[PDB]
Design a protein around this nucleic acid. Structure first.
Ligand SMILES: *[C@@H]1O[C@H](CO)[C@@H](O[C@@H]2O[C@H](CO)[C@@H](O[C@@H]3O[C@H](CO[C@H]4O[C@H](CO)[C@@H](O)[C@H](O)[C@@H]4O[C@@H]4O[C@H](CO)[C@@H](O[C@@H]5O[C@H](CO[C@]6(C(=O)O)C[C@H](O)[C@@H](NC(C)=O)[C@H]([C@H](O)[C@H](O)CO)O6)[C@H](O)[C@H](O)[C@H]5O)[C@H](O)[C@H]4NC(C)=O)[C@@H](O)[C@H](O)[C@@H]3O)[C@H](O)[C@H]2NC(C)=O)[C@H](O)[C@H]1NC(C)=O
Ligand SMILES: *C[C@@](*)(O)[C@H](CCCNC(N)=[NH2+])NC(=O)[C@@H]1CCCN1C(=O)[C@H](N)Cc1ccccc1
Ligand code: NA
Ligand code: NA
Lengths: 258, 33
DNA sequence: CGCCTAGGTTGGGTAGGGTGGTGGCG
């Protein structure tokens, strides 16, 4: 997260860390949608152009965390994956259209003050909240700057970062990049002459873009950190998988078996 | 199968359940107008 | 004692913490 701030404890109890067994390294973000289903971005698990193709055994999920590196004893829960389901029409060859994936845990996890699932949006909530100018919140343990080039500052945070960002008009998203935007995506972030800054970055992928419903005080995941060009650049906006437009697929997989 | 959680989803034990606002949620609410 | 900074599937923020049960010093 670029230009964010340290998250409060239990502020985002649905936040999940996608972790690699060997070597030990943080891979991505993800979100808890139930006691056994986790949502993330497909490119975190599968991106051939980069020799990336993790299977269930290669990874494990870490829930209830705050510190990026420490093992938070008697607080965080580490689960293993029973199965990974990547959207069958996930377009990795081109623009990462449908950058979404579900992961089923081997065993259900118990909730707590630090481990709680977020809501998936319904048509009404999606209709009333997915509006330019309306702000959502993005969280993650990703980079604080563009680490691929000499830049001043730390690269990764000690603690989970958070940042509130406004949804951007679709014509603006489209004109900010040469990459082909699809309905299954949306961009968010402040405009150049708009005062504040902020964005997600490498390592935040799979992280949730959530909005709080004024109609029921429930948090809803409207997006998934998918991609961007650079981080927090003027005239550039972070892109997010449009969770509601993929809601159908999500529910077919989740509700498919008893 | 979905499993447990849907009924109580999106309600944070250390916030909504305790009638407590995080330091920035108000900002989101204010943006919705 | 009152401090000091510490391993562990882990830092040092302090010996509790959003969590156990733990030292070594002057
Ligand atoms: C990222 O990296 C991954 C690896 O990590 C890589 O995957 C590899 O891809 C390569 C090339 O693309 C692929 O090569 C192929 O190998 C084929 C051989 O098939 C088998 O290969 C190995 C060993 O030889 C097995 O371990 C595999 O399991 C595979 O066997 C089948 O796999 C398929 C695909 O997932 C399965 O199909 C699903 O079936 C589901 C339901 O299944 C049932 C059922 O009725 O319930 C399961 C039952 O147990 C079974 N019952 C019995 C008694 O057998 C029945 C039954 O088999 C018949 O179906 C009924 O008559 O089926 C469900 O329907 C779902 O929709 C299906 O997807 C299936 O479980 C397995 N079947 C069997 C019989 O084992 C070659 O034939 C082929 O030509 C090709 O060369 C590798 O196989 C693959 N490797 C691995 C380890 O997966 C990816 O390529 C890479 N990804 C990218 C994008 O780069
Ligand atoms: C995997 C995620 O951590 C990461 C998120 C980046 C978000 N950036 C901003 N500014 N919000 N995603 C990526 O790095 C993706 C995956 C592969 C390449 N990529 C990019 O974002 C590229 N920088 C641009 C891009 C290349 C190809 C296809 C789509 C986008
Ligand atoms: Na920007
Ligand atoms: Na300790």
């Amino acid at each position: 997260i670029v230009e964010g701030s340290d998250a409060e404890i239990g502020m985002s109890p649905w936040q999940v860390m996608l972790f690699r067994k060997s070597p030990q390294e943080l891979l991505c973000g993800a979100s808890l949608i139930s006691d056994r289903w986790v949502l993330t971005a497909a490119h975190c698990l599968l991106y051939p152009p980069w020799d990336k193709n993790f299977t269930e055994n290669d990874l494990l999920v870490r829930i209830g965390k705050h510190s990026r590196t420490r093992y938070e004893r008697n607080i965080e829960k580490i689960s293993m994956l029973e199965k990974i389901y990547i959207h069958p029409r996930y377009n990795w060859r081109e623009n990462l259209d449908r950058d979404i994936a579900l992961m089923k845990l081997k065993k259900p996890v118990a909730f707590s003050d630090y481990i709680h699932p977020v809501c998936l949006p319904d048509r009404e909530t999606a209709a009333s909240l997915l509006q330019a100018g309306y702000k959502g919140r993005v969280t993650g343990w990703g980079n604080l700057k563009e680490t691929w080039t000499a830049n001043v500052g730390k690269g990764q945070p000690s603690v989970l970062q958070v940042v509130n960002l406004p949804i951007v008009e679709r014509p603006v998203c489209k004109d900010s990049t040469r990459i082909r935007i699809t309905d299954n995506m949306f961009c968010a972030g402040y405009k150049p002459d708009e005062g504040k800054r902020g964005d997600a970055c490498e390592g935040d992928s799979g992280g949730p873009f959530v909005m709080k419903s004024p109609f029921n005080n429930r948090w809803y995941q409207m997006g998934i950190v998918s991609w961007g060009e650079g981080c927090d650049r003027d005239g550039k906006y972070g892109f997010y998988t449009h969770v509601f437009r993929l809601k159908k697929w999500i529910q077919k997989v989740i509700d498919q078996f008893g | 199968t979905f499993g447990s959680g849907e009924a109580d989803c999106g309600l944070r034990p250390l916030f909504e359940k305790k009638s407590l606002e995080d330091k920035t949620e108000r900002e989101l609410l204010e943006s919705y107008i």
